[PDB]
Design an enzyme around this catalytic site. Sequence first.
Site, PDB file in Angstrom:
ATOM      1  N   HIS A  41       6.048  -3.473  -3.264  1.00 40.26           N
ATOM      2  CA  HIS A  41       4.797  -2.919  -2.755  1.00 40.26           C
ATOM      3  C   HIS A  41       4.991  -2.053  -1.516  1.00 40.26           C
ATOM      4  O   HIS A  41       4.115  -1.243  -1.190  1.00 40.26           O
ATOM      5  CB  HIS A  41       3.816  -4.055  -2.430  1.00 40.26           C
ATOM      6  CG  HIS A  41       2.927  -3.774  -1.256  1.00 40.26           C
ATOM      7  ND1 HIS A  41       1.807  -2.975  -1.342  1.00 40.26           N
ATOM      8  CD2 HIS A  41       2.998  -4.182   0.034  1.00 40.26           C
ATOM      9  CE1 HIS A  41       1.225  -2.907  -0.158  1.00 40.26           C
ATOM     10  NE2 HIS A  41       1.927  -3.631   0.694  1.00 40.26           N
ATOM     11  N   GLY A 136       0.867  -8.600   7.399  1.00 38.75           N
ATOM     12  CA  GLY A 136       2.221  -8.344   7.842  1.00 38.75           C
ATOM     13  C   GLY A 136       3.233  -9.396   7.461  1.00 38.75           C
ATOM     14  O   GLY A 136       4.428  -9.203   7.718  1.00 38.75           O
ATOM     15  N   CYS A 138       3.992 -10.255   4.404  1.00 31.73           N
ATOM     16  CA  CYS A 138       4.614  -9.946   3.123  1.00 31.73           C
ATOM     17  C   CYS A 138       6.130  -9.903   3.267  1.00 31.73           C
ATOM     18  O   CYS A 138       6.662  -9.325   4.217  1.00 31.73           O
ATOM     19  CB  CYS A 138       4.104  -8.602   2.593  1.00 31.73           C
ATOM     20  SG  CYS A 138       2.383  -8.592   2.042  1.00 31.73           S
TER      21      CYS A 138
HETATM   22  C1  LIG Z   1       2.370  -7.450   0.712  1.00 31.81           C
HETATM   23  N1  LIG Z   1       3.516  -7.491   0.005  1.00 31.81           N
HETATM   24  C2  LIG Z   1       3.289  -7.128  -1.343  1.00 31.81           C
HETATM   25  C3  LIG Z   1       1.970  -6.814  -1.634  1.00 31.81           C
HETATM   26  N2  LIG Z   1       1.377  -6.385  -2.934  1.00 31.81           N
HETATM   27  O1  LIG Z   1       0.251  -5.913  -2.929  1.00 31.81           O
HETATM   28  O2  LIG Z   1       2.047  -6.516  -3.943  1.00 31.81           O
HETATM   29  S1  LIG Z   1       0.998  -6.970  -0.237  1.00 31.81           S
END
Ligand SMILES: *c1ncc([N+](=O)[O-])s1
Lengths: 298, 300
Positions: A41, A136, A138
Amino acid sequence: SGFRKMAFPSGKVEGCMVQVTCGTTTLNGLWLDDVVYCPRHVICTNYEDLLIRKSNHNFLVQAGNVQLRVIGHSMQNCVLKLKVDTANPKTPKYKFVRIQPGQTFSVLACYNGSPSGVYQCAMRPNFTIKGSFLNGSCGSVGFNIDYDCVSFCYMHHMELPTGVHAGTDLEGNFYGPFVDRQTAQAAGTDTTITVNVLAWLYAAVINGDRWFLNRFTTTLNDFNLVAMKYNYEPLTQDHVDILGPLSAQTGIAVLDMCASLKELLQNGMNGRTILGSALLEDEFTPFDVVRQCSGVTF
Amino acid sequence: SGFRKMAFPSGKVEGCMVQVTCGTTTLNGLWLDDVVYCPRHVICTSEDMLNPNYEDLLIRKSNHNFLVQAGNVQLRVIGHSMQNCVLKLKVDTANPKTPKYKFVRIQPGQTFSVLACYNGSPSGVYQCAMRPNFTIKGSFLNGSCGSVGFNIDYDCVSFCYMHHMELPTGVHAGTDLEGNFYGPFVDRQTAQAAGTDTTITVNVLAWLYAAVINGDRWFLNRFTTTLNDFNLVAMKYNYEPLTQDHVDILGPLSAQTGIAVLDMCASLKELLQNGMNGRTILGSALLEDEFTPFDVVRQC
Ligand SMILES: *c1ncc([N+](=O)[O-])s1
Ligand SMILES: *c1ncc([N+](=O)[O-])s1
Ligand SMILES: *c1ncc([N+](=O)[O-])s1
Ligand SMILES: *c1ncc([N+](=O)[O-])s1
Ligand SMILES: *c1ncc([N+](=O)[O-])s1
Ligand SMILES: *c1ncc([N+](=O)[O-])s1
Ligand SMILES: *c1ncc([N+](=O)[O-])s1
Ligand SMILES: *c1ncc([N+](=O)[O-])s1
Ligand SMILES: [Cl-]
Ligand SMILES: [Cl-]
Ligand code: NA
């Protein structure tokens, strides 16, 4: 004495966390050997079309106060693999593993590549985890430690509307029926992890909490009809075998403990508590109980 | 989103843990710069654990009576001294992994992370609170003495607790890193008991504020209370008194949520009277008192 929700010591993982930036998106990456793993992402503004358009230099990787030069990029399922020109000297002995629902692991929550907290979680039967993540986070990762091996099993991707969290293994395969997009997604109805509740009742007994024990026993068939009634996962023979060590140590056979659990489901706790809880705890595995009561170190 | 009892990352502390042995007794020590800190009762003998004279036991020791092992490396003790209930062993090598650190003595209600260790090796990490009766509700088996508690706000490790002993009710007691016990306890095996414990009122209120930030409002009501009337009620449930300092401390969370502190006190009063009626707050069917106001802001 005492019994606590306990996370693995996180030092071996802390040395692997870095910050990955693409455009205006920043999130966490995992630096192992000469590769940084992070959620794909990070390239979002069609992942195939989005990635081929990218170039090594579009990725800014920061390990503390050192930039790492990206020399290659590839995608594996939902995970981006950034090859860097420097192997992480702090790489621990590790492997990538995929866990099953009901199994537990520690999460190292990080923001901008900086470790912030550690907590123990369970993969729920609906393939979500009840974590704590802000914007943040992720790319934060989950792991177990056995002996001296780090088994990485989770990378955090997103927050679902119910406040629970979804992610992938380190090969980019989602846990559960989720996709990495901004779209309408919902966790399925969750269930309680029966074998873990039994393990925690065994832990309670080992700690001197015995008021819920009774003289009665049941059968797997009889109990599973009760479990279905209360949205508890089925108890299998393999689960009974896994609880064998705890049954021998305490003198309470599993189906004897199931009769206690049945009673607690049907009648409640009558205002009492078990290991300081008024709810039935299901995020301790049988292994977790034996390990904590054995003092295993890493 | 979500709300978890969250410990600090433990790596900066893992790199400081060592094994200290004297005679037949082994426990954990904390290696910072060129000093190893550990409980002084490591120099006790099995016939003299009720009324040890530590001054007399220590003067009889040579530096080589102390075996300190950092992983696979044996450290050489070159000096020793006693500060209150902590032994300080000077070693010939400064720990290259020493973080930025300080020693802080905490007050009841404060939280910290514990790195449980056995034979100098880490077993796990979890959150604890200093109870009003100066005990902590931890997970400590035989050999965990010397394990430490700490916070890491910013990038400085604040060491606040060292584990010394287990009390009969299954709770735990220890010292600050200057060797002063929390509470009235002593490092002797004479009969000791914790005082009756109470609930940390200011922490419960902070946790209710976290619940509101998380989106839950079902426990609010239209009422308010005076501070004195709240304390008169809360004391009847074995709750700690709420002070004007605690009210001031909750100000930021009140501002963030728009719920005045004494209005949230009225909500807690009603929860104590009614229960939760089968509902939960932040995943719990009891009122949680081991999140501080500072913790709630840190995590939210
Ligand atoms: C944060 N990391 C990945 C995301 N996504 O939307 O796949 S959001
Ligand atoms: C990030 N999420 C969805 C994308 N797309 O392919 O349109 S990019
Ligand atoms: C996890 N621990 C050791 C490994 N190895 O095979 O090198 S993988
Ligand atoms: C697991 N092993 C021993 C315990 N205790 O409470 O003493 S818990
Ligand atoms: C503090 N408690 C819950 C939060 N959330 O983000 O849902 S913040
Ligand atoms: C935390 N305690 C002391 C520090 N220092 O910079 O020396 S940081
Ligand atoms: C941890 N080491 C020694 C103890 N004792 O009470 O004797 S507790
Ligand atoms: C000397 N050895 C053990 C002590 N204790 O009280 O735990 S004192
Ligand atoms: Cl029967
Ligand atoms: Cl509870
Ligand atoms: Na029974």
